[PDB]
PDB file of C-alpha atoms in Angstrom:
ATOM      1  CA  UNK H1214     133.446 131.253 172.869  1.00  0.00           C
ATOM      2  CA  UNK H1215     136.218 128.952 174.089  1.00  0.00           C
ATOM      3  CA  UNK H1216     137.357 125.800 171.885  1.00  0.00           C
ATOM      4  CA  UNK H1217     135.528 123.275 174.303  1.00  0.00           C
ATOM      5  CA  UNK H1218     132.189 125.506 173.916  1.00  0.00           C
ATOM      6  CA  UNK H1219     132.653 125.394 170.154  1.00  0.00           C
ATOM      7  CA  UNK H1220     133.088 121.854 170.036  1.00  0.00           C
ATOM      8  CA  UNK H1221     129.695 121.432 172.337  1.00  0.00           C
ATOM      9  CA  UNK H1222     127.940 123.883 169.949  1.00  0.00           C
ATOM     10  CA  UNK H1223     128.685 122.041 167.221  1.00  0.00           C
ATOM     11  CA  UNK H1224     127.800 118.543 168.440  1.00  0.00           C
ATOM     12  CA  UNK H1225     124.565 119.976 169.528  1.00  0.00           C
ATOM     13  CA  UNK H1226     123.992 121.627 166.104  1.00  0.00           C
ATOM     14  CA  UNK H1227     124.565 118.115 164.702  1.00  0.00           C
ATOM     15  CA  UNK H1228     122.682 116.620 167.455  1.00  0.00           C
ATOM     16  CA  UNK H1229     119.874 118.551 166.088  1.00  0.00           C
ATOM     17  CA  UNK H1230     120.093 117.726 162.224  1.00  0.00           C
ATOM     18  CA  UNK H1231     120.039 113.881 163.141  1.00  0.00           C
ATOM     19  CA  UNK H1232     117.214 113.336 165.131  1.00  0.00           C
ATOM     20  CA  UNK H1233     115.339 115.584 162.478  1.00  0.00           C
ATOM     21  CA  UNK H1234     116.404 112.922 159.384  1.00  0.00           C
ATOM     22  CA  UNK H1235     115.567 110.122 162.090  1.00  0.00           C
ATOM     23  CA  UNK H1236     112.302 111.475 162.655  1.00  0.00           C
ATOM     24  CA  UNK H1237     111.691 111.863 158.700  1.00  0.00           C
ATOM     25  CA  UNK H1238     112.917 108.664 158.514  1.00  0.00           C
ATOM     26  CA  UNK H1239     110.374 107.260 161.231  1.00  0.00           C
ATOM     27  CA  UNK H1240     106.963 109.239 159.719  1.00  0.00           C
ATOM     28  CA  UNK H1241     107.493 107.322 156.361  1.00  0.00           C
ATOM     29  CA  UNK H1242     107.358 104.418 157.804  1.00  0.00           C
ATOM     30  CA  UNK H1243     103.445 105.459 159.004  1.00  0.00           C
ATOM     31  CA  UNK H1244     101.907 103.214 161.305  1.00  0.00           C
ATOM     32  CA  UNK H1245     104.832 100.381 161.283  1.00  0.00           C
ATOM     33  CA  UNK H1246     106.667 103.412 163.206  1.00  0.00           C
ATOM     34  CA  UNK H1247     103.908 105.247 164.621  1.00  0.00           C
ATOM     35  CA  UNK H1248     104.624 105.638 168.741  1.00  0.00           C
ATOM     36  CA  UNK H1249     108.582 106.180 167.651  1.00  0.00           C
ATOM     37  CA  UNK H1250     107.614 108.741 165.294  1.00  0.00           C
ATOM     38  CA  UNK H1251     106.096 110.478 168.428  1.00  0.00           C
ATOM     39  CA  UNK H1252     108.672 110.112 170.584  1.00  0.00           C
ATOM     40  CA  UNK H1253     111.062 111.495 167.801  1.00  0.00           C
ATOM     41  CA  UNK H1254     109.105 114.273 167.877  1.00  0.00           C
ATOM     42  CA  UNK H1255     109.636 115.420 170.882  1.00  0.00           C
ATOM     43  CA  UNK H1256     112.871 114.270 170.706  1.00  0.00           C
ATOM     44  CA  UNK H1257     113.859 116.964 168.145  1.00  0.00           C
ATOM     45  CA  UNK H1258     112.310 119.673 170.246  1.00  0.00           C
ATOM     46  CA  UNK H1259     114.417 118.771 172.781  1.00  0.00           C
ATOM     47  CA  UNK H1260     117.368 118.804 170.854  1.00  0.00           C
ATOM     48  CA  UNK H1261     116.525 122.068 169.157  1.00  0.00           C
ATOM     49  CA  UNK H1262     115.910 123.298 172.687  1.00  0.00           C
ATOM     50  CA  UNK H1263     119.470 122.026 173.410  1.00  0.00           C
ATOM     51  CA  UNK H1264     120.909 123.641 170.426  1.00  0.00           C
ATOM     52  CA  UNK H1265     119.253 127.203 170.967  1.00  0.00           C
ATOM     53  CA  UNK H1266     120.146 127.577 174.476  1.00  0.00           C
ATOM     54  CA  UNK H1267     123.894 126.371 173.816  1.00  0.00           C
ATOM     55  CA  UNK H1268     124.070 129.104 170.694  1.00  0.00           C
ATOM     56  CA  UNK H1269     122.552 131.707 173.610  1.00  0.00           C
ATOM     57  CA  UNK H1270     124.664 130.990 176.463  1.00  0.00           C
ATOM     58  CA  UNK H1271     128.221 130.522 174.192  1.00  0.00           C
ATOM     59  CA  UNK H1272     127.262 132.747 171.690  1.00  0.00           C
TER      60      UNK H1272
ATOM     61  CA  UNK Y1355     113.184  94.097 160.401  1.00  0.00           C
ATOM     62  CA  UNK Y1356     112.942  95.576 156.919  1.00  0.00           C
ATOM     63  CA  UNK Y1357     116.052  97.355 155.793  1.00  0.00           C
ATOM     64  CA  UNK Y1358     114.200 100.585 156.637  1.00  0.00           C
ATOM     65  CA  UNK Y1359     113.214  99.744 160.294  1.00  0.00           C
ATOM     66  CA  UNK Y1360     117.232  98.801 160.320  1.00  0.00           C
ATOM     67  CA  UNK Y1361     118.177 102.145 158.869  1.00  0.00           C
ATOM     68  CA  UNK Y1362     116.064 103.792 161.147  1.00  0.00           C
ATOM     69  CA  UNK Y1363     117.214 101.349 164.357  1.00  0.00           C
ATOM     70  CA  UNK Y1364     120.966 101.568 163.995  1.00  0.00           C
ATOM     71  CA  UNK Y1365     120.231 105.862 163.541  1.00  0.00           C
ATOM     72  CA  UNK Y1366     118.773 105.798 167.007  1.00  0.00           C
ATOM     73  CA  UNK Y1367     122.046 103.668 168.575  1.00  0.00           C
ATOM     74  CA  UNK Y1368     123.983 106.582 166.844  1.00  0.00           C
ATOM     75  CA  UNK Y1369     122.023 109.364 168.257  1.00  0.00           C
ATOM     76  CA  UNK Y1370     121.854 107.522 171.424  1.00  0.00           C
ATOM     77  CA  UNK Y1371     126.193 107.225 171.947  1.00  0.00           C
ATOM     78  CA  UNK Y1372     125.742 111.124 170.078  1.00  0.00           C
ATOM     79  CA  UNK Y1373     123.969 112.507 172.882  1.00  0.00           C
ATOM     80  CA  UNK Y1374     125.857 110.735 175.981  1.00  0.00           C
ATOM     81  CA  UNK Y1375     129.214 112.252 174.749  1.00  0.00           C
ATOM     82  CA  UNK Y1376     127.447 115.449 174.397  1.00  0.00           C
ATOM     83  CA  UNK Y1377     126.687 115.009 177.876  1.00  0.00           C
ATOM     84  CA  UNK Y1378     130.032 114.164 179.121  1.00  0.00           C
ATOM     85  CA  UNK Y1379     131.330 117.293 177.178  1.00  0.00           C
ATOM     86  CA  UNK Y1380     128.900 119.602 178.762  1.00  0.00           C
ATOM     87  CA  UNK Y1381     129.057 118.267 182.421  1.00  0.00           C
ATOM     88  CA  UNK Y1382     132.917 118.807 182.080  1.00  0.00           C
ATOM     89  CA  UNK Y1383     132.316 122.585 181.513  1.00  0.00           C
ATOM     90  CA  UNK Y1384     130.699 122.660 184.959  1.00  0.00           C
ATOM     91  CA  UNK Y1385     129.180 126.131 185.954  1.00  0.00           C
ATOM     92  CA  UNK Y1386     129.602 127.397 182.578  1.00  0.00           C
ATOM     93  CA  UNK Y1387     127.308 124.662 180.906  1.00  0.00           C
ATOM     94  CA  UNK Y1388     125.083 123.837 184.137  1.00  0.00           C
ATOM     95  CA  UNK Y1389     121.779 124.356 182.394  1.00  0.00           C
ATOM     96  CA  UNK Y1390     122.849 122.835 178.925  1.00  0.00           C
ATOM     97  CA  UNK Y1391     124.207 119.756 180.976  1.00  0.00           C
ATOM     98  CA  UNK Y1392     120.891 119.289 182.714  1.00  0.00           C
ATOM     99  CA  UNK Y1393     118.852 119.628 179.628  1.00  0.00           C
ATOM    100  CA  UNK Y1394     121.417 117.235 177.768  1.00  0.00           C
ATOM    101  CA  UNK Y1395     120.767 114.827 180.679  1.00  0.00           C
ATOM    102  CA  UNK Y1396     117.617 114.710 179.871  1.00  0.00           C
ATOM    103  CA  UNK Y1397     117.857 114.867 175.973  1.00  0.00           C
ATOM    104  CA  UNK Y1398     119.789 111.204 176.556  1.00  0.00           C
ATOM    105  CA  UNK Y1399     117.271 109.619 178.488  1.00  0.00           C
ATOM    106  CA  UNK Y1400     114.484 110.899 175.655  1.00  0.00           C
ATOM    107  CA  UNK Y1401     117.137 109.224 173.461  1.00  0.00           C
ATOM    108  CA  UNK Y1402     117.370 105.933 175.300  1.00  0.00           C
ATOM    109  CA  UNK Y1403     113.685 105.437 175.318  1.00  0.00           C
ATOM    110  CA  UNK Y1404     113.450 106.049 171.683  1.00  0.00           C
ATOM    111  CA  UNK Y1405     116.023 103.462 171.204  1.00  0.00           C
ATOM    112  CA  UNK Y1406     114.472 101.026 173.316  1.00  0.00           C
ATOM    113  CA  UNK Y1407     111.161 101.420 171.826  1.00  0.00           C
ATOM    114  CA  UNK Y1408     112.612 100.736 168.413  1.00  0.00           C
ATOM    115  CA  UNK Y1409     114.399  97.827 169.448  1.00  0.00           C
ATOM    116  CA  UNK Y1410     111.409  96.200 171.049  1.00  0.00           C
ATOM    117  CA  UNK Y1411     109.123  97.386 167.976  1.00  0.00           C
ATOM    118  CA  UNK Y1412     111.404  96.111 165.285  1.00  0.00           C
ATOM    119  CA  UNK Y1413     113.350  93.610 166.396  1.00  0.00           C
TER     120      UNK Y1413
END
């Protein structure tokens, strides 16, 4: 992979991690949170769809 | 807010800037990131609304 493609990889990979502690963070706060948790949710996926197809095309 | 709904508020900001420069990054690798820019595209949007929606929810 080239430097800039590691560096994208890597945000992505981090990317990833954070919206999985944010959407932690967001279920324990049960219904006081509930619709954000939701979104978060598929907000992760996203990002772990992100992060898979970066690791596939750089990779 | 509770100190939580802050934790969890000031998180989404983050992973809101987060996924913008993850954006730029990939739209400046042209070609070789086309599909990983459009899906970061829309990654940022999912994270704007999530941001939104906890700003109106907790604040």
């Amino acid at each position: 992979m080239t430097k800039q493609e590691k560096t994208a990889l890597n945000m992505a990979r981090f990317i990833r991690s954070q919206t999985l502690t944010l959407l932690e963070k967001l279920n324990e706060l049960a219904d006081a949170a509930d619709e954000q948790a939701d979104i978060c949710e598929s907000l992760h996926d996203h990002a772990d769809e992100l992060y898979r197809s970066c690791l596939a095309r750089f990779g």
